[PDB]
Amino acid sequence: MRLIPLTTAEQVGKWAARHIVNRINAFKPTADRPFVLGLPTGGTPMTTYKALVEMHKAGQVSFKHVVTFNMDEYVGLPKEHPESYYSFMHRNFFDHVDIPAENINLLNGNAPDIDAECRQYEEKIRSYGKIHLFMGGVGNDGHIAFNEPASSLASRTRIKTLPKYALTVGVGTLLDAEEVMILVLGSQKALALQAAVEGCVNHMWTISCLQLHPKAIMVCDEPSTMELKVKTLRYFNELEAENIKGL
Amino acid sequence: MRLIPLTTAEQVGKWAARHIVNRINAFKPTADRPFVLGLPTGGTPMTTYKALVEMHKAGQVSFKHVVTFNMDEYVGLPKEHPESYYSFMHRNFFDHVDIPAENINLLNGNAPDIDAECRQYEEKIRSYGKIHLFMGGVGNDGHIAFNEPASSLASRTRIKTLPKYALTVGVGTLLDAEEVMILVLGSQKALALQAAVEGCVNHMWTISCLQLHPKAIMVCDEPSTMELKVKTLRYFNELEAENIKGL
Amino acid sequence: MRLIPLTTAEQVGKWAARHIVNRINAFKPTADRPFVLGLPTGGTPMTTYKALVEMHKAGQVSFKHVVTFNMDEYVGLPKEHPESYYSFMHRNFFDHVDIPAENINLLNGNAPDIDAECRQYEEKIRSYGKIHLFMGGVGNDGHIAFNEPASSLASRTRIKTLPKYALTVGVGTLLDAEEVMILVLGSQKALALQAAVEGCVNHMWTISCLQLHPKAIMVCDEPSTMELKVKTLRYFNELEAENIKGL
Amino acid sequence: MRLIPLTTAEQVGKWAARHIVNRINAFKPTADRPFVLGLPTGGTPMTTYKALVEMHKAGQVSFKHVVTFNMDEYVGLPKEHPESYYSFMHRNFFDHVDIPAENINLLNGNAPDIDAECRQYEEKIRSYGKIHLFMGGVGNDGHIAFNEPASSLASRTRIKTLPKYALTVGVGTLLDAEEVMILVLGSQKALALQAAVEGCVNHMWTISCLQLHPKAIMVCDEPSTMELKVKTLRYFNELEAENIKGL
Amino acid sequence: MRLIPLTTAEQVGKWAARHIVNRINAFKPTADRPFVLGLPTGGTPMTTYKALVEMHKAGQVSFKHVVTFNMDEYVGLPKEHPESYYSFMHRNFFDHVDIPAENINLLNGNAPDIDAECRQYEEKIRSYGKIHLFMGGVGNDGHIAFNEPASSLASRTRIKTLPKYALTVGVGTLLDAEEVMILVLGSQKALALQAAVEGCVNHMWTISCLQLHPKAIMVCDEPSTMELKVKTLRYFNELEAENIKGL
Amino acid sequence: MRLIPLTTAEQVGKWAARHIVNRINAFKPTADRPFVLGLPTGGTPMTTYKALVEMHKAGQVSFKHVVTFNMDEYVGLPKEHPESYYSFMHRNFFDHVDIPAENINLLNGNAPDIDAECRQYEEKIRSYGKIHLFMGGVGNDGHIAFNEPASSLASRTRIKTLPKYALTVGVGTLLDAEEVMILVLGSQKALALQAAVEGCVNHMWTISCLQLHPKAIMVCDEPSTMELKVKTLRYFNELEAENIKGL
């Protein structure tokens, strides 16, 4: 596991954005072999989308052959409603880049057959093969997306009771990704960061199971490191010193 | 992982029995595709077998196309002896339902080649493919069947020194099941329940490794929850409130 | 997991050597199906190589059809230099047994393309299929070879900054072995032994992840048991009592 | 230590009030030997003052010979200001009972010599000899009054930087009381209750040092027991069952 | 604190007896200045009384000017009943030594005024001044005598609900002794020994508060050391090696 | 307790020296009422003595009416030997200030009656009444002076087996001081600092018992904070920010 210790939310976004750009440019996606990106919404990834957009506008990356899968969506909420995940994603990212509509995958919270919708979502991911990079956030209690603490590590896309319900990818869906990058911002995430980095593996703090994942990265700001031991932060600061230059 | 918090041993048996019945009826087993059930013996599963039998007698389930695999048997003990696992299983379950003899699998503690017997048992399970549901109990120290604490998670059916010896399925045998349901009864199992639900993954408390299993369920009575935090029990009580109605 | 509690470094070497000999003789390797052995260097395995050599000289084993893979090598250091891993392995083992040069695999710290060298090493292992037994040591902080604490459990052979650099097999490389045997000597390894045997699974103490491995063995001397609970040592002493007779 | 597990804030107040009444009536205070009561302010003791007042109005207790000492007061804030501790105490308690003005002791946040004011407060307590019962609340982090975590257990009345400052009795001032009763309400106090009852003595959670006090009582509501083990709460519930009847 | 690690219950008794004898002979008690000894009953101190008696019979000590105070007695049970603490003490100790009746203090479980009886017991101890050495045992949960876990460290002699009731000295009564020596026998006391020696101070395990006592000694047998770290036992074994020679 | 987080050993010495100077100048010692200072030796207090001497040379303090008591001395070692505590104290402190010989107290490691020497040392301290400030260091295992881990908190000056022996003040001797200031330097003291500040009270880490002392201060450098949580250090850094200006 990697822990990228940065100071501000803006630096985290710039670091995360650059990592995504580098993975894409190294993969060199084409129509027949697209780069598959898993994505989150909310306040946490705000600075990352902002950074991704300026990099695209500077000509550093193209999303023409990038396929995305989002983590969740509200049930029964009109897609064009300003508070839907769909609206958030277009407003903060899709409206500003060259990704084609057919490459965008968002759960349809208005699907007639909920169980069928979730099933097809998992099917769509497998049709491509695998998610190359899945970016996410982490709950104050260490949970992922709308998955509950003590969720099975093999859980799949399904409906969850918090609108009244939401569709969310499962922990297994996230773990099947080739690489997982979690954005950690704020002192309210300090206990979750501690559980992920210093604690032992346990299903109550879902984030701790990333210790078993082949390629996991935590990108965090200063306030989120409050519960770590001084030597833990020092260790990652020194090891990652050359990789945070320029952010 | 699911934790079904109930009050009495009788409720646990009724809940466990209904879960087995529902899995069977949803699977709709036939001669060519039987539902494979893993089973334990002893005082712990008593109320569950009792409940399974009345459900069968009420016409709610048929074991005609259910194949069973038991966890253990004593070595050198006459099969028809009243204290054998064979006698226990027939007396408490097989004597009262419509399962055919060819669908019953019990380790032969009188086999001439012990190692061959255990090897064939594993072979029999694979011939069917997989155990759909494996029900078991848990030791005071968190162990499973006759497996020792610190047993390998990939251990297989073998002989164990406690009669003098016994044949027991391994932890790997149990983990390969599609779903694992552990019955937890009594305050003497309180530390084991705590290790399974709140503790971290560790090979000393074998039960804790179910946290890594794709579909694990703990069904417990009130006395067994003594070592859990009040909020842990409250959390599962609320989440499972709708699934324990009627038991 | 097995824990073989012995008194001295010499006993550990004799026990480890005999275990290797027994695995080889039971496997009965041939030119078309060789026994693949993973090996470490340093002060820790000294008594084991010494024991392996006398067993070979007594006619108890032949390495004619044994293929070896070593854990590491220094970068840019002349192969014939007295401090290289190559020199250590020949001087302490290869010079005294009947293993053919083509069966010896050591990382080439002088390869022009470092990344290619490491890639081919992994390729060579897969060409044989799998390492049947990988023997290693453990760092004071629980690390393996030159892998850092918090290394990914799927890490592979690569270059590491400590000469200035070294090539080292990854944790995944080690875990892919059919059986892993770690030699633990000295009170300085007491905290690592404790983490491996009594602690919970966590990526900070890499050795703790052997709890998830299908066949792991820790062979230790008396000074290394300082951090274990008296009952833990008593438990393994009794369980392994019959397997340490004669060492 | 005693732990009185009750359900609601109202029950806690009724239990605490009755305990104070019983201590007073058993002490039988007179002009020459008054019963000395330490008191807190805020939302926590609201139901207790309410209960104390109705008991007084029912003729169950008289405060004619009861001397009180309050925990704190704001600095530079006009005494008659509606938000002062003085205003709170009169409005919620003194306005409704028969305690004489000369028996009321409140820190003067407008004293010209702050250090002298605090010094005299301690002097006043010693002039009476000792506080017979000191009632207080507890911070989310286990602190007492305005004392900081890691405060000396012998700290005394002094000014503290949070108005801008406040005068607060010290931990030593509280511990010198013959009996200490802490009101614990709300899930936000759950970690503090756990530290006080189940944790070990440590200066970071000041409340934990009451374990060393000769006569300490925690009176809590249901939401505050969230972090205790089920068996801990069960133990106190059974032991105190006869003392909570009627509240 | 001292920890005397011995092998058998007999050795513990011989060590404890010799310690008592040495303290007495060094004190050189007279009619005006007697040596005050606190004593327990039950299976635990059996080998110690046996050893004390043979030492007396060998002329190594006289109890002519030794005053004793016992920890408890049953309420309402006839003093001469074979199961009373009185009968146990005479049968195992007083019947065999030269202590005068006026020097023996046992709680009167048949006293008309229970509270008065307990009050006078404390008064009797103070009349002498202090207990020079108090020997006791420890509960499986770390408790002392009939004091409950979480008992106040300043608790005094009082009646306790387990006959139906018993009179028991308090924790404060024990702590006021100049020296406290606790006999620890059996694996069932392993967790209590661990809490006393390696754990932190906390009122739930009363025995842990002896860490704060000026002169505490734990005398234990081998089975009771099961929960200690190997290095902890090694440390005390080496430090006390010269003081256990001859037992 | 106070924790003064500084960066270098030199800053620690300057802070500690100034604190001593301020305590002396506020006390205003005279021939009839001297300021009593407890002192340590070794590498740890080096920068503090250096700072104390320049302050004296600058006219900021006089030791004319300061009485000192040192923690230890070697047994049987010639007082004027260059490695004695006597030589260290004169060479690093007494040779440079105006303290009179009669105000200096050092244990006489060559006294004919060891036990008498230690007894008189304690007597000398009481003759003055109390040590106003005792400065010391801390062992890697949390011990004080030559006191062993698990030493009684009431231990007194006595001989200790490490020359072969040394005379050392006891933990009780240190705790009886009005104020205790411990200098903490180096990463090797990180675990001890953690036990003192964040851990719970326990006799194995003697330094942790300072949590119970009325006025304890830890003055530490940066390397010693390695085992503290980032938020712990942040908390003390902010609280002590105004008291470390100028060092």
Side-chain angles (χ1 to χ4, degrees):
Chain A
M1 174 182 294
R2 290 182 65 190
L3 177 62
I4 313 300
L6 300 164
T7 306
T8 67
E10 169 149 301
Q11 289 179 292
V12 167
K14 288 176 177 292
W15 196 95
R18 185 178 62 177
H19 188 69
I20 285 163
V21 163
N22 291 175
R23 290 300 194 199
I24 289 171
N25 291 341
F27 188 88
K28 313 193 75 60
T30 67
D32 183 65
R33 198 181 60 104
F35 180 88
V36 188
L37 215 193
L39 296 171
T41 58
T44 298
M46 288 302 288
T47 63
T48 299
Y49 285 126
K50 180 193 170 187
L52 274 177
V53 171
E54 179 36 65
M55 293 183 84
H56 174 243
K57 294 196 172 313
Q60 296 169 54
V61 63
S62 167
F63 293 94
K64 198 172 302 174
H65 293 118
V66 168
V67 167
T68 65
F69 278 95
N70 260 72
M71 299 192 337
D72 16 62
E73 184 55 282
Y74 287 119
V75 174
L77 192 279
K79 183 180 295 297
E80 295 85 0
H81 185 101
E83 298 309 299
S84 74
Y85 289 83
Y86 164 95
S87 290
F88 174 103
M89 287 305 297
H90 283 285
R91 180 171 61 237
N92 289 295
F93 187 50
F94 305 140
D95 289 350
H96 317 287
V97 302
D98 61 345
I99 184 171
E102 68 200 78
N103 284 7
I104 296 170
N105 295 278
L106 281 157
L107 283 155
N108 178 7
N110 295 301
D113 190 320
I114 293 298
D115 282 35
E117 172 58 28
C118 295
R119 183 187 311 105
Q120 304 180 307
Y121 207 62
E122 292 289 340
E123 258 155 20
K124 235 292 183 64
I125 296 166
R126 296 160 197 153
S127 76
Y128 283 106
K130 66 177 176 299
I131 292 183
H132 302 291
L133 176 60
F134 211 136
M135 179 169 76
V138 64
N140 288 5
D141 62 3
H143 78 270
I144 288 169
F146 281 105
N147 291 284
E148 65 276 19
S151 282
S152 163
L153 282 55
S155 56
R156 294 288 160 182
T157 302
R158 64 195 182 288
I159 183 171
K160 292 291 301 174
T161 302
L162 309 185
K164 229 63 184 294
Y165 305 76
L167 266 34
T168 186
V169 294
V171 182
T173 315
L174 185 272
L175 293 172
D176 283 345
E178 180 181 312
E179 176 176 39
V180 174
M181 183 180 75
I182 305 298
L183 275 26
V184 189
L185 302 176
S187 62
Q188 62 175 165
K189 305 304 186 186
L191 290 169
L193 216 216
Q194 196 287 328
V197 179
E198 290 179 358
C200 293
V201 177
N202 76 86
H203 70 160
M204 286 304 314
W205 289 82
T206 305
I207 194 71
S208 75
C209 299
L210 284 185
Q211 284 182 30
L212 303 183
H213 193 278
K215 209 176 306 185
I217 307 177
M218 307 295 276
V219 189
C220 71
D221 66 354
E222 174 182 303
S224 73
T225 65
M226 289 302 105
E227 299 282 354
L228 299 179
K229 281 182 171 183
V230 169
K231 69 175 186 177
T232 299
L233 186 56
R234 178 177 255 57
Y235 171 74
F236 285 110
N237 268 321
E238 303 188 318
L239 174 65
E240 295 295 358
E242 292 309 302
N243 298 320
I244 70 169
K245 319 184 80 64
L247 289 308
Chain B
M1 174 182 294
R2 290 182 65 190
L3 177 62
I4 313 300
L6 300 164
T7 306
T8 67
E10 169 149 301
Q11 289 179 292
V12 167
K14 288 176 177 292
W15 196 95
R18 185 178 62 177
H19 188 69
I20 285 163
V21 163
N22 291 175
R23 290 300 194 199
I24 289 171
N25 291 341
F27 188 88
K28 313 193 75 60
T30 67
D32 183 65
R33 198 181 60 104
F35 180 88
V36 188
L37 215 193
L39 296 171
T41 58
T44 298
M46 288 302 288
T47 63
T48 299
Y49 285 126
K50 180 193 170 187
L52 274 177
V53 171
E54 179 36 65
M55 293 183 84
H56 174 243
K57 294 196 172 313
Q60 296 169 54
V61 63
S62 167
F63 293 94
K64 198 172 302 174
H65 293 118
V66 168
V67 167
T68 65
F69 278 95
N70 260 72
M71 299 192 337
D72 16 62
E73 184 55 282
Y74 287 119
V75 174
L77 192 279
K79 183 180 295 297
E80 295 85 0
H81 185 101
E83 298 309 299
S84 74
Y85 289 83
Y86 164 95
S87 290
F88 174 103
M89 287 305 297
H90 283 285
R91 180 171 61 237
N92 289 295
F93 187 50
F94 305 140
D95 289 350
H96 317 287
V97 302
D98 61 345
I99 184 171
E102 68 200 78
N103 284 7
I104 296 170
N105 295 278
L106 281 157
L107 283 155
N108 178 7
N110 295 302
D113 190 320
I114 293 298
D115 282 35
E117 172 58 28
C118 295
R119 183 187 311 105
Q120 304 180 307
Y121 207 62
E122 292 289 340
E123 258 155 20
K124 235 292 183 64
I125 296 166
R126 296 160 197 153
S127 76
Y128 283 106
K130 66 177 176 299
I131 292 183
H132 302 291
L133 176 60
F134 211 136
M135 179 169 76
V138 64
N140 288 5
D141 62 3
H143 78 270
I144 288 169
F146 281 105
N147 291 284
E148 65 276 19
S151 282
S152 163
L153 282 55
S155 56
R156 294 288 160 182
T157 302
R158 64 195 182 288
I159 183 171
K160 292 291 301 174
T161 302
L162 309 184
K164 229 63 184 294
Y165 305 76
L167 266 34
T168 186
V169 294
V171 182
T173 315
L174 185 272
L175 293 172
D176 283 345
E178 180 181 312
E179 176 176 39
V180 174
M181 183 180 75
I182 305 298
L183 275 26
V184 189
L185 302 176
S187 62
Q188 62 175 165
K189 305 304 186 186
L191 290 169
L193 216 216
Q194 196 287 328
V197 179
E198 290 179 358
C200 293
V201 177
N202 76 86
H203 70 160
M204 286 304 314
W205 289 82
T206 305
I207 194 71
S208 75
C209 299
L210 284 185
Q211 284 182 30
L212 303 183
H213 193 278
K215 209 176 306 185
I217 307 177
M218 307 295 276
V219 189
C220 71
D221 66 354
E222 174 182 303
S224 73
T225 65
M226 289 302 105
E227 299 282 354
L228 299 179
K229 281 182 171 183
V230 169
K231 69 175 186 177
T232 299
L233 186 56
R234 178 177 255 57
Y235 171 74
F236 285 110
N237 268 321
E238 303 188 318
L239 174 65
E240 295 295 358
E242 292 309 302
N243 298 320
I244 70 169
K245 319 184 80 64
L247 289 308
Chain C
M1 174 182 294
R2 290 182 65 190
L3 177 62
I4 313 300
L6 300 164
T7 306
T8 67
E10 169 149 301
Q11 289 179 292
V12 167
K14 288 176 177 292
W15 196 95
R18 185 178 62 177
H19 188 69
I20 285 163
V21 163
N22 291 175
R23 290 300 194 199
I24 289 171
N25 291 341
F27 188 88
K28 313 193 75 60
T30 67
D32 183 65
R33 198 181 60 104
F35 180 88
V36 188
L37 215 193
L39 296 171
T41 58
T44 298
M46 288 302 288
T47 63
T48 299
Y49 285 126
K50 180 193 170 187
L52 274 177
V53 171
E54 179 36 65
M55 293 183 84
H56 174 243
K57 294 196 172 313
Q60 296 169 54
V61 63
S62 167
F63 293 94
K64 198 172 302 174
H65 293 118
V66 168
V67 167
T68 65
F69 278 95
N70 260 72
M71 299 192 337
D72 16 62
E73 184 55 282
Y74 287 119
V75 174
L77 192 279
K79 183 180 295 297
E80 295 85 0
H81 185 101
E83 298 309 299
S84 74
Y85 289 83
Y86 164 95
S87 290
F88 174 103
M89 287 305 297
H90 283 285
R91 180 171 61 237
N92 289 295
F93 187 50
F94 305 140
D95 289 350
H96 317 287
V97 302
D98 61 345
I99 184 171
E102 68 200 78
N103 284 7
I104 296 170
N105 295 278
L106 281 157
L107 283 155
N108 178 7
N110 295 301
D113 190 320
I114 293 298
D115 282 35
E117 172 58 28
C118 295
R119 183 187 311 105
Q120 304 180 307
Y121 207 62
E122 292 289 340
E123 258 155 20
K124 235 292 183 64
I125 296 166
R126 296 160 197 153
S127 76
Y128 283 106
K130 66 177 176 299
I131 292 183
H132 302 291
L133 176 60
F134 211 136
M135 179 169 76
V138 64
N140 288 5
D141 62 3
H143 78 270
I144 288 169
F146 281 105
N147 291 284
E148 65 276 19
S151 282
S152 163
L153 282 55
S155 56
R156 294 288 160 182
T157 302
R158 64 195 182 288
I159 183 171
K160 292 291 301 174
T161 302
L162 309 185
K164 229 63 184 294
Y165 305 76
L167 266 34
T168 186
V169 294
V171 182
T173 315
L174 185 272
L175 293 172
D176 283 345
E178 180 181 312
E179 176 176 39
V180 174
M181 183 180 75
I182 305 298
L183 275 26
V184 189
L185 302 176
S187 62
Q188 62 175 165
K189 305 304 186 186
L191 290 169
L193 216 216
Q194 196 287 328
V197 179
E198 290 179 358
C200 293
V201 177
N202 76 86
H203 70 160
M204 286 304 314
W205 289 82
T206 305
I207 194 71
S208 75
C209 299
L210 284 185
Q211 284 182 30
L212 303 183
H213 193 278
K215 209 176 306 185
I217 307 177
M218 307 295 276
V219 189
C220 71
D221 66 354
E222 174 182 303
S224 73
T225 65
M226 289 302 105
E227 299 282 354
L228 299 179
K229 281 182 171 183
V230 169
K231 69 175 186 177
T232 299
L233 186 56
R234 178 177 255 57
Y235 171 74
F236 285 110
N237 268 321
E238 303 188 318
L239 174 65
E240 295 295 358
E242 292 309 302
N243 298 320
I244 70 169
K245 319 184 80 64
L247 289 308
Chain D
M1 174 182 294
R2 290 182 65 190
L3 177 62
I4 313 300
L6 300 164
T7 306
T8 67
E10 169 149 301
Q11 289 179 292
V12 167
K14 288 176 177 292
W15 196 95
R18 185 178 62 177
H19 188 69
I20 285 163
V21 163
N22 291 175
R23 290 300 194 199
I24 289 171
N25 291 341
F27 188 88
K28 313 193 75 60
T30 67
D32 183 65
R33 198 181 60 104
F35 180 88
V36 188
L37 215 193
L39 296 171
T41 58
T44 298
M46 288 302 288
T47 63
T48 299
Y49 285 126
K50 180 193 170 187
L52 274 177
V53 171
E54 179 36 65
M55 293 183 84
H56 174 243
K57 294 196 172 313
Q60 296 169 54
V61 63
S62 167
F63 293 94
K64 198 172 302 174
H65 293 118
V66 168
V67 167
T68 65
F69 278 95
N70 260 72
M71 299 192 337
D72 16 62
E73 184 55 282
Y74 287 119
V75 174
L77 192 279
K79 183 180 295 297
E80 295 85 0
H81 185 101
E83 298 309 299
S84 74
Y85 289 83
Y86 164 95
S87 290
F88 174 103
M89 287 305 297
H90 283 285
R91 180 171 61 237
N92 289 295
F93 187 50
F94 305 140
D95 289 350
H96 317 287
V97 302
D98 61 345
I99 184 171
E102 68 200 78
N103 284 7
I104 296 170
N105 295 278
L106 281 157
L107 283 155
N108 178 7
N110 295 301
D113 190 320
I114 293 298
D115 282 35
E117 172 58 28
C118 295
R119 183 187 311 105
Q120 304 180 307
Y121 207 62
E122 292 289 340
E123 258 155 20
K124 235 292 183 64
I125 296 166
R126 296 160 197 153
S127 76
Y128 283 106
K130 66 177 176 299
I131 292 183
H132 302 291
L133 176 60
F134 211 136
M135 179 169 76
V138 64
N140 288 5
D141 62 3
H143 78 270
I144 288 169
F146 281 105
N147 291 284
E148 65 276 19
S151 282
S152 163
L153 282 55
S155 56
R156 294 288 160 182
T157 302
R158 64 195 182 288
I159 183 171
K160 292 291 301 174
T161 302
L162 309 185
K164 229 63 184 294
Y165 305 76
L167 266 34
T168 186
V169 294
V171 182
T173 315
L174 185 272
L175 293 172
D176 283 345
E178 180 181 312
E179 176 176 39
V180 174
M181 183 180 75
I182 305 298
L183 275 26
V184 189
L185 302 176
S187 62
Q188 62 175 165
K189 305 304 186 186
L191 290 169
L193 216 216
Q194 196 287 328
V197 179
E198 290 179 358
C200 293
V201 177
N202 76 86
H203 70 160
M204 286 304 314
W205 289 82
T206 305
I207 194 71
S208 75
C209 299
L210 284 185
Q211 284 182 30
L212 303 183
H213 193 278
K215 209 176 306 185
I217 307 177
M218 307 295 276
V219 189
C220 71
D221 66 354
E222 174 182 303
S224 73
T225 65
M226 289 302 105
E227 299 282 354
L228 299 179
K229 281 182 171 183
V230 169
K231 69 175 186 177
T232 299
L233 186 56
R234 178 177 255 57
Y235 171 74
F236 285 110
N237 268 321
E238 303 188 318
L239 174 65
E240 295 295 358
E242 292 309 302
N243 298 320
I244 70 169
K245 319 184 80 64
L247 289 308
Chain E
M1 174 182 294
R2 290 182 65 190
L3 177 62
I4 313 300
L6 300 164
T7 306
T8 67
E10 169 149 301
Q11 289 179 292
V12 167
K14 288 176 177 292
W15 196 95
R18 185 178 62 177
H19 188 69
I20 285 163
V21 163
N22 291 175
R23 290 300 194 199
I24 289 171
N25 291 341
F27 188 88
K28 313 193 75 60
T30 67
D32 183 65
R33 198 181 60 104
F35 180 88
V36 188
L37 215 193
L39 296 171
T41 58
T44 298
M46 288 302 288
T47 63
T48 299
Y49 285 126
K50 180 193 170 187
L52 274 177
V53 171
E54 179 36 65
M55 293 183 84
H56 174 243
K57 294 196 172 313
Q60 296 169 54
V61 63
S62 167
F63 293 94
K64 198 172 302 174
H65 293 118
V66 168
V67 167
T68 65
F69 278 95
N70 260 72
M71 299 192 337
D72 16 62
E73 184 55 282
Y74 287 119
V75 174
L77 192 279
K79 183 180 295 297
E80 295 85 0
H81 185 101
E83 298 309 299
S84 74
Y85 289 83
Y86 164 95
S87 290
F88 174 103
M89 287 305 297
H90 283 285
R91 180 171 61 237
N92 289 295
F93 187 50
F94 305 140
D95 289 350
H96 317 287
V97 302
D98 61 345
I99 184 171
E102 68 200 78
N103 284 7
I104 296 170
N105 295 278
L106 281 157
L107 283 155
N108 178 7
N110 295 301
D113 190 320
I114 293 298
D115 282 35
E117 172 58 28
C118 295
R119 183 187 311 105
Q120 304 180 307
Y121 207 62
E122 292 289 340
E123 258 155 20
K124 235 292 183 64
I125 296 166
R126 296 160 197 153
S127 76
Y128 283 106
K130 66 177 176 299
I131 292 183
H132 302 291
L133 176 60
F134 211 136
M135 179 169 76
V138 64
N140 288 5
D141 62 3
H143 78 270
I144 288 169
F146 281 105
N147 291 284
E148 65 276 19
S151 282
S152 163
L153 282 55
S155 56
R156 294 288 160 182
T157 302
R158 64 195 182 288
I159 183 171
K160 292 291 301 174
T161 302
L162 309 185
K164 229 63 184 294
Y165 305 76
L167 266 34
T168 186
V169 294
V171 182
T173 315
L174 185 272
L175 293 172
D176 283 345
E178 180 181 312
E179 176 176 39
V180 174
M181 183 180 75
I182 305 298
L183 275 26
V184 189
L185 302 176
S187 62
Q188 62 175 165
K189 305 304 186 186
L191 290 169
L193 216 216
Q194 196 287 328
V197 179
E198 290 179 358
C200 293
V201 177
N202 76 86
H203 70 160
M204 286 304 314
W205 289 82
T206 305
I207 194 71
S208 75
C209 299
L210 284 185
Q211 284 182 30
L212 303 183
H213 193 278
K215 209 176 306 185
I217 307 177
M218 307 295 276
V219 189
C220 71
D221 66 354
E222 174 182 303
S224 73
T225 65
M226 289 302 105
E227 299 282 354
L228 299 179
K229 281 182 171 183
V230 169
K231 69 175 186 177
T232 299
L233 186 56
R234 178 177 255 57
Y235 171 74
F236 285 110
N237 268 321
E238 303 188 318
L239 174 65
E240 295 295 358
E242 292 309 302
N243 298 320
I244 70 169
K245 319 184 80 64
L247 289 308
Chain F
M1 174 182 294
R2 290 182 65 190
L3 177 62
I4 313 300
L6 300 164
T7 306
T8 67
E10 169 149 301
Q11 289 179 292
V12 167
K14 288 176 177 292
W15 196 95
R18 185 178 62 177
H19 188 69
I20 285 163
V21 163
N22 291 175
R23 290 300 194 199
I24 289 171
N25 291 341
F27 188 88
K28 313 193 75 60
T30 67
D32 183 65
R33 198 181 60 104
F35 180 88
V36 188
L37 215 193
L39 296 171
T41 58
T44 298
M46 288 302 288
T47 63
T48 299
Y49 285 126
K50 180 193 170 187
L52 274 177
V53 171
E54 179 36 65
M55 293 183 84
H56 174 243
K57 294 196 172 313
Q60 296 169 54
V61 63
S62 167
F63 293 94
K64 198 172 302 174
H65 293 118
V66 168
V67 167
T68 65
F69 278 95
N70 260 72
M71 299 192 337
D72 16 62
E73 184 55 282
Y74 287 119
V75 174
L77 192 279
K79 183 180 295 297
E80 295 85 0
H81 185 101
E83 298 309 299
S84 74
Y85 289 83
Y86 164 95
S87 290
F88 174 103
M89 287 305 297
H90 283 285
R91 180 171 61 237
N92 289 295
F93 187 50
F94 305 140
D95 289 350
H96 317 287
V97 302
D98 61 345
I99 184 171
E102 68 200 78
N103 284 7
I104 296 170
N105 295 278
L106 281 157
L107 283 155
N108 178 7
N110 295 302
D113 190 320
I114 293 298
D115 282 35
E117 172 58 28
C118 295
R119 183 187 311 105
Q120 304 180 307
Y121 207 62
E122 292 289 340
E123 258 155 20
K124 235 292 183 64
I125 296 166
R126 296 160 197 153
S127 76
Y128 283 106
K130 66 177 176 299
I131 292 183
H132 302 291
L133 176 60
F134 211 136
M135 179 169 76
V138 64
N140 288 5
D141 62 3
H143 78 270
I144 288 169
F146 281 105
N147 291 284
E148 65 276 19
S151 282
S152 163
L153 282 55
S155 56
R156 294 288 160 182
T157 302
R158 64 195 182 288
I159 183 171
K160 292 291 301 174
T161 302
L162 309 184
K164 229 63 184 294
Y165 305 76
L167 266 34
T168 186
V169 294
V171 182
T173 315
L174 185 272
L175 293 172
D176 283 345
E178 180 181 312
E179 176 176 39
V180 174
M181 183 180 75
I182 305 298
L183 275 26
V184 189
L185 302 176
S187 62
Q188 62 175 165
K189 305 304 186 186
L191 290 169
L193 216 216
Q194 196 287 328
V197 179
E198 290 179 358
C200 293
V201 177
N202 76 86
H203 70 160
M204 286 304 314
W205 289 82
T206 305
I207 194 71
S208 75
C209 299
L210 284 185
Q211 284 182 30
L212 303 183
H213 193 278
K215 209 176 306 185
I217 307 177
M218 307 295 276
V219 189
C220 71
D221 66 354
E222 174 182 303
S224 73
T225 65
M226 289 302 105
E227 299 282 354
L228 299 179
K229 281 182 171 183
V230 169
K231 69 175 186 177
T232 299
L233 186 56
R234 178 177 255 57
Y235 171 74
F236 285 110
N237 268 321
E238 303 188 318
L239 174 65
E240 295 295 358
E242 292 309 302
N243 298 320
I244 70 169
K245 319 184 80 64
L247 289 308

